[PDB]
Every structure is written in structure tokens, then in C-alpha cells.
Amino acid sequence: SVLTKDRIIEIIERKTGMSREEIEEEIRKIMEEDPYLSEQGAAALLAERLGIDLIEKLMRISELYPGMDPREVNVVGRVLKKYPPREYTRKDGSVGRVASLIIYDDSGRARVVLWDAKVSEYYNKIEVGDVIKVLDAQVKESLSGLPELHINFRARIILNPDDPRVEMIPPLEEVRVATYTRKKIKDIEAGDRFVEVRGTIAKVYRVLTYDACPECKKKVDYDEGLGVWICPEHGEVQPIKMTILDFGLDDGTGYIRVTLFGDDAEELLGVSPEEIAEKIKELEESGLTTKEAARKLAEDEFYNIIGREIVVRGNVIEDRFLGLILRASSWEDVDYRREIERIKEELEKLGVM
Amino acid sequence: TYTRKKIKDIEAGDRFVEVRGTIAKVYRVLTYDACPECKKKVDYDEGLGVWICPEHGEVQPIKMTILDFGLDDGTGYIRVTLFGDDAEELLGVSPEEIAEKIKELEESGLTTKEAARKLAEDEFYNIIGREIVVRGNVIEDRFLGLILRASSWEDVDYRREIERIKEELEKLGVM
Amino acid sequence: TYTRKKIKDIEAGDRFVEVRGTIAKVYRVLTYDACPECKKKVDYDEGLGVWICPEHGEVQPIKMTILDFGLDDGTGYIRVTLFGDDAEELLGVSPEEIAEKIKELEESGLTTKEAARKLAEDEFYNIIGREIVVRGNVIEDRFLGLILRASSWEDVDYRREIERIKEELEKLGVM
Amino acid sequence: TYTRKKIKDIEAGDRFVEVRGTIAKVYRVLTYDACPECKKKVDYDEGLGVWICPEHGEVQPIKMTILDFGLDDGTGYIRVTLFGDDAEELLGVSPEEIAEKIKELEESGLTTKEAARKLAEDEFYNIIGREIVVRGNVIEDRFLGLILRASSWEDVDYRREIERIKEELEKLGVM
Amino acid sequence: RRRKPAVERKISEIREEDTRVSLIGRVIKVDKMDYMFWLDDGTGVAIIESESDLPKVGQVVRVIGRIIRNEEGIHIYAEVIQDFSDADLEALEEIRELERKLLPRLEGEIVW
Amino acid sequence: RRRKPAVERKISEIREEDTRVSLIGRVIKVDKMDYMFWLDDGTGVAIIESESDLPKVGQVVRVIGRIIRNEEGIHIYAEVIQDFSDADLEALEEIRELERKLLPRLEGEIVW
Amino acid sequence: RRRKPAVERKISEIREEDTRVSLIGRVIKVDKMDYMFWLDDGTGVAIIESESDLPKVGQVVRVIGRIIRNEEGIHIYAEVIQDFSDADLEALEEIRELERKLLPRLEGEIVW
Amino acid sequence: RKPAVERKISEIREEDTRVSLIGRVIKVDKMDYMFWLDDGTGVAIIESESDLPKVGQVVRVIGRIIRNEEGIHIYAEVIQDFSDADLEALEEIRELERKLLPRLEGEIVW
Amino acid sequence: KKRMPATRLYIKDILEGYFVKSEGDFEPNYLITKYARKVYRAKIVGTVVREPLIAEDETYGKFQVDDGTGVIWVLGFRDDTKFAKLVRKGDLVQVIGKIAEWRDDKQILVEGVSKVHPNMWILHRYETLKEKIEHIKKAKIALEIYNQYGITAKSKVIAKNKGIEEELLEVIDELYGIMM
Amino acid sequence: KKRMPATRLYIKDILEGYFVKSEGDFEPNYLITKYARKVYRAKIVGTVVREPLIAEDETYGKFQVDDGTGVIWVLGFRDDTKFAKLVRKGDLVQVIGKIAEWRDDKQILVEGVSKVHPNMWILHRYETLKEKIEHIKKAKIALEIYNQYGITAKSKVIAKNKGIEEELLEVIDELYGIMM
Amino acid sequence: KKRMPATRLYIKDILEGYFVKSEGDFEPNYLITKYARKVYRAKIVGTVVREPLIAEDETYGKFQVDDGTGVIWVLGFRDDTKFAKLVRKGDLVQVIGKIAEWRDDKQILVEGVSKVHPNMWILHRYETLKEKIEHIKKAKIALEIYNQYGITAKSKVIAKNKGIEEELLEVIDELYGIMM
Amino acid sequence: KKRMPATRLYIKDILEGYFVKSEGDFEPNYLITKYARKVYRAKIVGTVVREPLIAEDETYGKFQVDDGTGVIWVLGFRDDTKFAKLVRKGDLVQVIGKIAEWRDDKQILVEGVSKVHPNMWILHRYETLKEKIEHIKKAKIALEIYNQYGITAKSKVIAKNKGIEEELLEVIDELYGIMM
Ligand SMILES: [Zn+2]
Ligand SMILES: [Zn+2]
Ligand SMILES: [Zn+2]
Ligand SMILES: [Zn+2]
């Protein structure tokens, strides 16, 4: 709300020391020049001439945490990754149109989720490497513990703003990440860390959902005698359902088991964990056991992801009953030209050309 | 017996006339009450609360269908009306269904005639462009011109029409 | 000098009449050679094979444009023919470019009238719907009705129209 | 004479062994020349052009058939080979038909082993699933392990097996 | 559900039941970091939230937009901004009063 | 550049220059494993392929499609297949004769 | 009739014996009323006749179709149409040449 | 579906629907395609569809009973011959089955 | 060979008018507003609120116009889409065209569109107001004349004596007929 | 009230005709064929060739029609697109509609489409041939009556006493006026 | 290069067993009975209830086998369909084949079927009961060894000195794991 | 509990390999290619050429895959038939699966089918070419040790220290036995 006519007079009285009658005379001088201005507008113009009108008076992504007033949301960012739009069912039963985007600055990175009609408004016009100005939006905590940006109706997105912080964003080429290690399957042993493997999803072992702490993102034990979930890191907490996925990777020289946790599995399957929850529940309603229902769910409906190449990375460990398994920190789809270059250099080593 | 005649030669007062052609338009579709024995119109009396047929006394009303469309045969255009059984035989839907449809249009907040027109043009638009041969008599309306009241209708007999065209070609000076 | 007159009251033989209206259709655009100084059609006589103006002698003609469109003002439809440089001002384009456009359209194998009408319809369709004031003399054609030859044109005024409609309301008795 | 035994206890080097079971799979069907007196394969000499039998001098060879299949008794799986006329009675097809059929197989561009396999699996599949009693000896082969060479085969005797089942059931402790 | 029509009202006479508002007036000054500006009508000052185009100080313009009601106050989501500084306003206000004092009775007469 | 319509021609009178043809005949044998069927109109036999559907054997059919000419053979790729089981062929042939007998002279009438 | 693999060849190397060919290129000109489009792969321009759908102009596409050989010209009877608007053509041509100049010799080595 | 049931003429029960019987044909009738069986203890009326057995041989029939007001009739569907067979062993093994089987599944758990 | 003039309307009068669809081929579709005005071709002045929506193959192009009194879908079909290529969202326009129906909503089949100054918007306001009040009083005068006799030769004669145009009588007759 | 009858035609004769677009309100756009026949509504029988392209927003529909002599683009706009839902590839239909011009290519704006039996196809062919023969005979009879004498009052007398319809002569005169 | 011998079963046992699907390329599927028995190849003797149905393209052939205990669907794919041609309705046959579960229902994949004599059917009842009693007594005498110690060296040592196969302990362990 | 890795192959290698059918239930079927390579599971990339064919009772589903050198059949039986509904004509798919033989023709049983991008197709070409070259090199290296030494312990040790893998030796021996 703009300051009232009396409020501006009080501010001008404090910042200048002129009496109310003197200010009223200066106001009366104004509409003589412009009779179409309001009394409040005349006071605002007088303050602008006096230099007082700045009553209404650099933020990065790192300092942002859930719970800010959207009015304070003013950040910039260059597109890092662009996800295809997805579909979600609203609370009323209608199906909504949901899309996610990845942007970054020199201070950090954040995940933004674009909702409903706005996707047609901004998703089409936005491309990778572009700069986005963010205002009046909501901040939410992710399953990974990093802030997520929810673009609702009140939120606004601007293409190519005239902000000084645009130039200080590093380009995509300068973006640096970890190195990990590229390795073939046949020559890895237990305990080898930071290893990446590219291949084909050849088998779907298990899909599960279970309750976990919403703060440290780890499983919570439910106490039968007490009736709540006790986290031995935060005490009693409200559980959140998160999913795990166990599948098998193949490369042409071997075949290994890989475990995916939480958000990455969510993106790979493309369904929120809640649906996994009621599907598991309604399989349980058929009298089947938990693990049998999990295998059935993995087999009957999520069979469409077999045969798609991925590039996973993580740390490998050994189990005495299962063999070698690979806990995946994260996964990314392929990049091709790089793999073509590797094949070319391998041909050169072979001594064919 | 019925006599075949081109639509151009149709004048008010002719009887026992049959016409071949195509359905070019649909004007109205509806249903109304009639006596269950003579299939004639009955009058519902609000004061008596009963239906009176001045041939059978009080009777139980039955639904009969009224259909109005337009027929064209390449030389003219005539409005044709169909009553009762043959109408829903051509449409292929039980008359009680038409009664339910016109009613459900009525409580929508719409009056009877425009509801009938909407029903005619919104669900029965597939009968346009079908070869039809009708038999009946012509009657003049001071509001609508010539009207053909079809007693009954049937599909076209191909062989007779082929022979007619052959005869006309022979007469014209080719065969 | 110049008298205002509603279209509904326009009859043949009216002289020095100006109307306010809206361009509701474009009929034809064309151009041709005429005497540069008196703005009159010159005859390309084939006996001497020269452009003669038989009121000034032998002259070298220059190009000028003719436009034929239609005007509507909420009371009746009239046709307007605009001559020469006024058409250039209204369209904002030189006559010469119009000339080579006409040539390149007609060389495609089209009649001069048909090519002219095609040019009018497919290139000058963005001027219809605007508000104009026409000013000229009314002529009668046997096969065209009433046609207004425009001596000059000017865009509509605002305060004069406002005061005239205000005084008309005063005559009405609303205030 | 012949001693009853079970497949689980069958050991190489055993002779005069009689077993009962069912045919599960057929391995090979072949026919080759042999002496008509000692029923032994004759040696064809390229330098002589004749089939010498080095126990009766030169003789005219005659066809004789060899069968290879597999037997199950519920306790083990044994490959078994049968000679000549016993296979004739079991299969019911005279050897010249087998010779003609195999030759029919090899003009297509097939050598002996796969052609015999195809003929066995294409026209002699109906004989598996039929109970058979075999009598013969156990032999050991470096690749095929245990093989029962059947001197003769006989149909299952139901009553003796029924009484054997009854007496073993009594020894179990049921009655 | 057809789109609702715009209704012309003044800042000092803004009603609660309204949703879409067309406002005619002068901007006093603009804050660019927020893409927002202050619009003066002659009877009040309003907050107008621009999306992609920003005006300049001292021109009479007409903006059609949506109103938002919250605890913060009255901030108007601008949708379409148009220039009007080269125009009349006295006759506009006059026809506004005439229009308002004539419409209530016009449809009152003439039954069916 | 208007498209050439389906010229109606006989199998025994198939011309080299044709690109799209229509036939009316009867199927004599069908091979569903290869999507082949043999069309015999009484004056010759031709092979016709299929997109997804094959008719059963013994009924009159009409096929509109493009001619595939190569060294393997002269066969027609079907595009549209219709059933003329109840059709009368004699009248159709009679009008075909009447048409190519009359039409060329008919167009000669009328001047400019 | 065993089905022949779709042999892939460049436009200017189209042979007379070829039956089913796959062509990869771009559409520089299309026609919707004839439903026919021209491919310009750099070495030449080709006429392709579609059945139900057409691509746009300038977007890289791939097509698999049979050959229409006649005195009029060389047309290809399309059946399969896919888009390649974002592919590395240089790698494709490099691997094509590499495959061509390797494989015939590779089968030569080893015996039985 | 319902597994085939085998029963006996004098002990046939109402609850049974599809039943197997064994008996000897004593006489037939072609007008109704029907015939009579005896197993030494009773008479069974069997209504065949088109096939006809002969009199005096032991046979087995798979049919379904028709419990109507017209009398006793068996809607037979299968007949098979056993003239070469025995039956005392069949009866003894049936008795063994009845006196053993229902006890066996009750033994042991999971 | 004549063309009837366009009449200037408020959009609201267009939305809840009574649409008479033609039957023969020698007369056009038209609209009868509440106060018995016969409208053939409409002409409006107003703003555009949304981006024009035109198909990729320039078959049809439609957008929206608002005069502060309603929402109207201005359409242009086939080769009329060129008109829809002249409009960008956020500008005053003047539109002229026919009136037609679809899915129970009034739509203007476009015939011409142009950009125009606000002063013409004020002119449109004044003109439509005066025309509306004129037709109101004329129809009110004709109401009792219709009610007392209806359509009779004496009624036509006396209506001519008061100087009421002939058409209004049958306009009122058709309006009353469509009342039932 | 008068709806003029629909005449049966070959597609080629429709695609070859001369189109005259009416200017006034009370006149329809029509097509004068090569042999001086005036058609308002066309009724053809043909085989659907390609699958109907129906807009997702339910605005326009279109499909092609062949009958052995030409292929034409049958359209349907606005509320008429429902008709373009009743047919599919391979069908054998009968189509009745108006005549429209677009991009120098003729089209039929549909007002009715319905499937038929092959006997309808044969009868349609006979009927169109016979009707064409009759009209070309009449035009041959009238051509010399027009060209030798012209348009005179006694020319109409001659036309009526020899059984020549009056409309044929001004149709022929307009045809010539077009072709010069 | 080994083959496990087939085993004779009641149909209800196959119907009400537990299907363990091996996932490695060096172990096949198998079936666990309620009484802790491992079955690889089924082998039953019974009567067909329905006529064989065979696909026209010779791809799959299945029919129904019944003995009074249950009805089972015996299947053959591809070239095994010839077996489905060897049997006519109403006969008393013997079937030997594999085990595989479809839509939560057990199945027998055919490998060999033959005509037989009823005396063998009595022999079949004899043999199946003789196997049943021995295996159930073995399970009974091994259950205490399982649940007293578990998977320990001493447990299997005392079991093998008692006269019980060691693999039965692992079979019981697998069945108990399937229980929970 | 092991599963052998899948190999990447040209269709012209699957068509011209030798199919070895295992007899024991503990070993799977396999195929030895012309250049002495044993394949358990194949993994091809190809374009579908015809519409997927589905059983009405959906006991099987099959379609055709082509990459540029030959056309092969993808089958799915019983439970797996769902896979045959994941693809449509005109797609660029990647198929991982097993190998099956039926009427002297080699076919693939699907185990996973997934759509890919053209860049996947290019990667497939490059990778398969590299693998083929490497295997040819190793094969010609090991062939002369096989021929001039034979299968002896010292020969195997020399192969081990000469960079030749062990089981390739009996691969060569099996190929030589089969070709005989
Ligand atoms: Zn916690
Ligand atoms: Zn009555
Ligand atoms: Zn001059
Ligand atoms: Zn000898």
C-alpha cells in the first residue's frame, strides 16, 4: 500500500523541517501546474523534487531457505539443465501440467518447478544458457535438502532482465564439477569409490517406498509401544515417504546391480512416491506379502524402462548374500559426442586408421 | 395406386404421388400423444386431468413421432413430413427416447420448438444424403407452401430406375 | 460552398457534397497517363502515334492513379472514386511503383481489369475499416447507380463532430 | 538270466540287467549295412569294391537299424541303444522306408548326423511317453557316460509290477 | 464460462467485488528492480505491477489489469498498457457521468 | 499441378505411363504371411500387396493403388480396398463402353 | 520372397537395380496439395511422394521408401518418415565411409 | 473348473453336478438316444447325444445329472470302454484313497 | 445489388440478442436485439486482450475484443486470416463484420479491421448512445400502435400517419412470436 | 422462401468452370460451367482417398474426394466440422454442398455427407451422363438463336415457341462476356 | 551335462505349490510343494476333457488334462504344437513336461504325450501314493533337525548320519523364507 | 548365480551364425558366429518396418526389426507379449534379448525394448564396428596357436601369456567340430 497523504506530509516534515502549512502551500502550488494530480500524488511529486521519495528502500541463491516472504525473492540464474514437462494430478482430481528446470549462479544452484498454465507461458520461450529473473515466488525444501522454487500464479518469470548480476554469472563452459572415475564393469572390486559406468538397464529387481526423516533424509523407526516415528538424530519427526529402486546395468563386459535413492529414482520413473505408496498398499490388500508385492509392482507396470542407456556414478560395496552392488550418488543421461570421441581414440589405439 | 412424377409438376391438391430424391435438410423432430387404438390425436383436459379421444373416450396416451425434412431430386425442393412408426424406423430410435430427449431439453430452460430444432440438428444429422422414395399426397399451407405428407417410404429399387434412365436415353436420341 | 448531407438523402445531380463514413470495401486500383499540367486524359492517336491533349497541343503525359472503393456511414452504402495525387496521399506510395506492380501482375496472363482488381484486393486490404471524410460531386451511372467523384479528401475531425452530436442531443431533449 | 535293478544303482560293467521306465526323448535313428549271418557290420574295401565280412568271407550286405533314445524311471536318466529287429517291432516301420527317408533328407544338402537328428525329431516324436521294459548291459563312453545297450525289449507287465508295489508297500509298514 | 468484461473505475472508488480494472492516469515514478510503478489518477495513488514493458514518468496512460487482495495491500497486476497522453479526458469524464446516469433506466422500459 | 485421378484401366491394357490405377476383380489366392493376394479379372492375373489387411478368398473386390515397376515383376501396391460383393458388373462395363464411345465427340460441341 | 534389407545410398549414386532405398537429407521445397516433397542432400534433388503426413521445410529428415522407375523420372515411394533435426551428420558420413572401406576385407581374413 | 467326480449309483448325492459312473449296458432306445446301465447294484438312465453303446460290456461314463421333474436323467458327454479291464483293484485303491487321503493333508504345517 | 449499412452497437447488446438464421438462399442471417433493432453488419471500437491465435496453415485466425461491456470472439476464415495478421495484442482497434453463431455464443465473422485513435473511441461511445436512445423512443411509440391492432391495413396507415417506419411493425411481430 | 435445387455433376466439370462471386446481399456466389449451366449446390458421389484431417480444437475439417475424373478438397468450417467426423479412408460416400473459391482452386463447402452402396455409384453415373446430354443438346439448340439474332424481344418469343428457356440465353451472354 | 529325473505328482499339488523362478543363466525354474519337495519336470496320467484348439498359423497349441483331482492347461509353443495334434478328445493319456506359471496360475509346458491303458492308471495311483508317503515321512523326520539347530555343520552331520539328504534342509529353509 | 553379458551384433552375423542347442537343463542355448564368437544375449538397434502383430488372446506378440543389413523377427510369448505393444511402425528402437531358432531361421526373444535418439544409432554403429575389429584381431592371433599346437596345457599357458583368453580355445575347437 502506498503511503497515505498524511503520512507523506509527516515524512517530509521530518526530513526537511518545514511546517505543515508551508508544505500545504507547496502542494497548492502543484495542482495549479497540473490539476489532474491527486493530493497524495502532489505530496509524492514534492517529495521527489525534494529527494525524499525513496521511502520504499544483491541477493544470491545460497542464503535462501524455506519460509521467506515472496516479496524478498529477487535472484538471477543461468539455465543448467532443462527437464521435460510432466503431468501431475491436482487435489480436485484434475491433471496438472508440471515442469522442472535447473539454473545456477556463481553462488550456487537451485531447482525450480514450473506449474499449470505458466509452462506454456515461459517453458517454451526459455532455453538452456538463458538468464532468468525471479520475483514474488515461493521457496520449498527439496528431498535433497536444497531449496526448491515453486512458480505459482503469483510468481513471475522475466526473460533477459537488465540486472547487473547477469554479467557476473559464469557461463556454461566454465561450470566445473567433480571428476569421479570412468571404469569398465569387469575390473571393479568391492570398496571402490567414485566410479561411473555407462550402459543399458537390463533388469528391474525391486521398487519400494518407505518412511524417512524430513530433515536428515534417512529412515525413521516407528515405535509400536509409543505410536510415533523416533529419529535418533532429531527425536520424534513426521515421516515422509521416499522411494528406492534396485535395477541391473549391462555394458557388454559384465552386469552389475545398482541402487537408486529418492529424487533421482523419482525423475527416472516419473511418478511421485505417493502413488507408489497406495499401489503397494493395494497390493498388500490382496493378501500378498511386502516383498512379493514389491517385485510384482516392479515387474507388471514399470517394465518400460528396460533397454534405455544411462550413465550412473557412485560407490560399490559387497554383500555376502547378493554379491557386488553399486550405491548410485546420481545419474545422468548420455552426451554422445564424448562417447564418439572415446570410440575414435580406442580405434586409433587399435591401429586401424 | 401411386404415380411417379417429377417434383416440378407437383401442384397443390394432387393425391397418390410418389417422389424419389435425397434428404437435403432436417427441419423438426419430436413426439406427441395419441390414442393407442386408432393412432389418432387425443386431447388432454386440464379440468378433467384425462386424455379424451372423440372416437374411443378416455384412453392411455402413446407416443408417436413427427419428423419434418426436405427432399431434393435435382429439379426442385419440397418439404416432407413423416408420422409415427415409419419416422422412428428411419431414425432407428424408440419414440420414448425422443420423448425423453425433448423433455430433458425442456428442463434446460428452453421452449418446445427450439428444443425440437436443436434435437433435429444436433443428433440426427447423419440422415442427410440418403436416397429415399416416398409415397403420399400434397397439401398447401398458407405459411409454408407445398407439403408432402408421406404415408410410407422405402429404399430405392435400382433396376427400375436403371430401366427408366435407359428409356429416357433411348427417347433422347442416343440409344 | 460545401454542404453536409447524410447518405440517405443523397440523390443524383447533387453538387458540392461532403460525407463522413467508413471504407467498407475496395473495388479497383489503376493508373494511366494524362496531361501533366491540366490533369486531363491524353489520346495516344495512332494517326500520328503521339500523346495529344486537344486543348493544349502536344505534351508528354505523366502517370496518375484512380481508386474505386465503397463507403458506409450507418445509413446507406455509396461508392467513391478518387483521382490522381489524392490516392497517392491516401495510400502513401508513388504511382510509378503501382505501375510496375500492375505490369508484373498483368504479364502473368491476366486481363487488365482482373489484374487491377487483384492488385486492389491482395495488397490494399489494410485500409478498410478506417474513418474518412469524402468531398466531391455525385454522378449517376446506368449500370452502377450513384458514384461520388472525390475532388479532395481529408481525415475525420473530432471536436466538430463532438459539438455537432452534442447539439443534436440538445435538440433531442436529453439535456 | 536277467536281474532286476534300479537306475540309481546302475553301474558300468553290469550285464543281464532288466529295467522298467518311460521314454522321454529320442536321440538318433540310423540304418547301415551288416552281414546277414552274424548281424555284424561289414567292411567295404575300396581296393576290392566289395563288403568283406572277416568271419564269413565276402557276403552281400543288408540294412539293419540302430536306435538311440532316453529313459526315465523317476530316479535317473539313461541313454539307451537298441539294435535291429527289436527297433523294427517297437517302431513298426520296415527299414527300407527309413533308408528312403534318410536319403530324401541328404539330397537336400545335409550330411548324416543332423539329417538323422531331424528325421528322428520330425517323424519319430510320438513314441516318447510310453512305458518300456529294457534288458541289456551297461557300457561306458568317454563322452556320453553311461549307455544301456539293450539286447531285447519287452512290454510292461502290469500285474507283476502291481504285486511288487504291494510287497514293497508292505515292507514300508503301511499294512 | 466466458471471460468477464473490464469495468472502468477510479482509485478512490475501487470496489471490493471487482476483479479486473481499467485505470486511466499519470505515473509519478517507477521502481525498476521490482518492475513496478506508482500511478496517480487525481484522486489517489496505486501500485501497478508491470510484466515486460515499463512506462516513463509524466505520461497519461490507460492500463487494464487484475487486482489482488491480501494483507500487504492493494497491488494491481497490469496486463495491457496503452498511451493516452495525446488525448482528451474532460469529454471522457463527461460521457462517463452521462453513461452512468442513463443506463439504469434505458433497459427499464420496453417490455419484451 | 493438380493430382492425376485414379484412371480406370484393364489389366490386359495396362499402359507404361500410368502411375495410379484402380481394378475391379476377384481374389483367387491369398498369402497372409507375406501380405500378398492374386487378383484375376478374367483377362489376366496380378499380384497386390497390402498395408495391414487382407480380404478372404472368393469375393469381388476393388483396389485403388500405385503401380510398382521393377525387375522383380509388375505388381500393384494397394492403398484402398473396397468390397463390391453385391455389385452388378455388366451395367458398369456397359456404361464404360458408352462413355469412351460418346464423351470424346461430346466435348467437340460448342464453339469458344 | 525373402524381404531385402533397406539398402542406404546417396542420391546421385541411385542404381537401376536398386529396389528399396533409404534417403537422408532435408526438405527445401514441399507441396501439400500434391503431398509431395523434394529432398536436397547436397549432391542432387529428389522427388518423394508421401501418403499421409508431410515434413516441414529445412528440417533434416530420413525416409525409407521403394523406387518408382518410369520414363517421367525418378520418384521414390515413401513409407517410413523420421526426423533427424538434431544429429551429427559428419559422424554418420565418416562411419559410412569407414564401414565401406573396412568390411569387405574383414570377411576375407580367417577360413572356415 | 470343477474337477471330475466319480460316484456310485445307489450313493449318488444331490450336491454332485458332474459325475463319473461305471456300469454295464442292459438295454437301449434309439428314439431318445438313451440307454440303461447296471453296475450290479442299481439302474442308471443315461441320455446320450448321438453315440450308442452295446449291451453287456463294462463301460465308464462322464456326465452331468439333470435333477428335474421328468425323472432321473444323466446328461452324458463322455463314454469310454473297459471290456479288457479289471475292477476289484480299482475298488480297493478307491477304498485306500478314502481311508488315507483326507488325513494326509491335515498332517504337517506350512 | 445493394448492401445494407453497418450499425454501431455495444457488445452486450450483441451477446444476448435473438439470432434469426436464414432459411432460403436469397436472404442473410441477422440479429434482433432486445429493443427491436435489426442488425446485419456490426462495427465496434475497442481493445484487444490476448495474442491472436492463427493456425500454422493460415486456415483460420481468431482473437478477442472487449469494449468494457463483454467479450467477443472475432474470427476470420480461409483467406480472411490476413486480417488477423494485422493485430498485435495491446492496441485499440476498429472492427467491422457480420454476425454468426457457434456453440451458443455470438461471434463476428470479420470483414475489416484497422488501428484507430482514442478520439474515435469517444466518437463510437457518443454515436451508439444516441442511436440507442433514438431507437428506444421510436420503439416505445410503436409499442401501443402494435398492441392496439397489430398488423392491419388501418394499423399500417395510422403508423405512417405518425411517421413510424413500416419495418418496426413486423420486427415487433417477429419478436413477440419468438417470445412464445 | 426458395432454395434452388442441387445439380449432379462430374468433378472435372466443377474444376473447369467459371466462378462468379456475388456482390450484393441478396445474391449467391455461383459457378457457370463450360457449357452454360448455372450451379449453386453440387451433389457428387465418390471414394474417400485420404484420412480426414480434423482440427483438435473442433474448428475445421477437410478431406479429399475422388470419383474417377478428379480430386477435390471437401471442407467444413465452424459447427459443420462434425460432418468431417462421419467418414474414413476407403469409404464410398455421397456429398452435397455449396461451391467456394480459394487460392485458384475450387472446393465444396459441405452441407451433407452419407455413405452409400455401389448400386448408388452406377445409378449416379447413368444419371449424370443423361443430365449432361440433355443440357448440352439444349445449349446447342440455343447457341445459334443467341448468336444469329441477339437479345431482342422477338428473340424471347422464338425461344419460347421452340421450347428454349429464357434463362439459357442470358447465361450464354454472360458466359461470352466473361470469356472476352 | 546332467538331467534331473522327472517326478510324478497329483494335479492339486502343482496347482497349490510355490513357483520359484530362477534368475541366473545356470539354474532353471522349479516348484516347491507344501510338504517341501522340489519338482522340475511334471509327469501326470489322466483324461482330456476338451477338444484341442490350435492356432491357424501353427504357433501355440494347448488343451486340458484331468484325472479327477484337477484340470490343468497343457501348452506347447512353436514346433511343439505337433503334440497337440496327436491327441483326440475323450482318451486317457500320459503327459510329461516342464513347469511355468502364467497369470498367477500354474501350467505344464508339454514335452511328450502318449496313449495308454487304464491298468497303468491304477499303477499311477500306486506309484504316486508310494512316493507321497516316503517324501512326507522324510519331511516329517527332517523338520525337527531343521528347527532344532538350523544351518550348522553339526545339524547336517547328524542329519546325514541319521539318513536324511542334506539338500532337504536348504529346501525347508527356502520354503520358510517364502513363508515370510 | 551369474548372468552372462549381452553382446552388440550386426543382423548379418545373427543370420549366418551356428546355433548350438544345449541338452542339459543347467546350460543355455547359444550361437557361435562365423568368426568364432559365442553369444548368449544379443543387443541390436533397428527401425520397425511393419505394424506390430498381436494375438487376440495375446498369447504372443511379434514384429520386425531392421537396421540396414537385414530384417529379423522380435517375438514375445505368454507373459512377455506386453512388450509387443510398446512400439509402433516408424520408430528407432533398441532391443536387448535372447536368441531363438525356428524353421532354420534365427529369431530374437525380447527381454527389453526401448526407444532411442539417432545419436544412439550412430553410437551403435561405431561401437559394434570396434568390437568386431577387436574380435577379428584376437581370432586371427589365436587361430595359429590352435592349429600348430592343439589343446594342450602348455598351449593354454602360452595363450595365457600371449594375451589370448582361455575359453576361446575350445570355442575354436567347437567351431571346427561343428563345421565338419
Ligand atoms: Zn532425522
Ligand atoms: Zn381413439
Ligand atoms: Zn493538357
Ligand atoms: Zn558275418
Residue numbers in the entry:
A (entry chain A): 2 to 58, 63 to 358
B (entry chain G), C (entry chain D), D (entry chain J): 184 to 358
E (entry chain F), F (entry chain I), G (entry chain C): 6 to 117
H (entry chain L): 8 to 117
I (entry chain E), J (entry chain H), K (entry chain K), L (entry chain B): 2 to 181
Task: Quote the passages of the study that discuss this structure, keeping the authors' original sentences.
We report three crystal structures and five cryo-EM structures of Pyrococcus abyssi RPA (hereafter referred to PabRPA), in its apo form as well as bound to ssDNA. We find that archaeal and eukaryotic RPAs share a conserved heterotrimerization core, which is composed of three OB domains connected through a three-helix bundle formed by a C-terminal α-helix from each subunit.
Unexpectedly, aside from forming nucleoprotein filaments in the presence of ssDNA, we discovered that PabRPA oligomerizes in solution to form higher-order assemblies in the absence of ssDNA. At micromolar protein concentration range, PabRPA exists predominantly in the tetrameric form, as shown by SEC-SLS. The PabRPA tetrameric supercomplex is formed by two dimers (AB and CD) arranged in a C2-symmetrical assembly, which interact through contacts involving their Tri-Cs. An interaction between AROD and OB-4 was also observed by Cryo-EM. Instead, AROD participates in RPA-RPA inter-molecular protein-protein interactions.
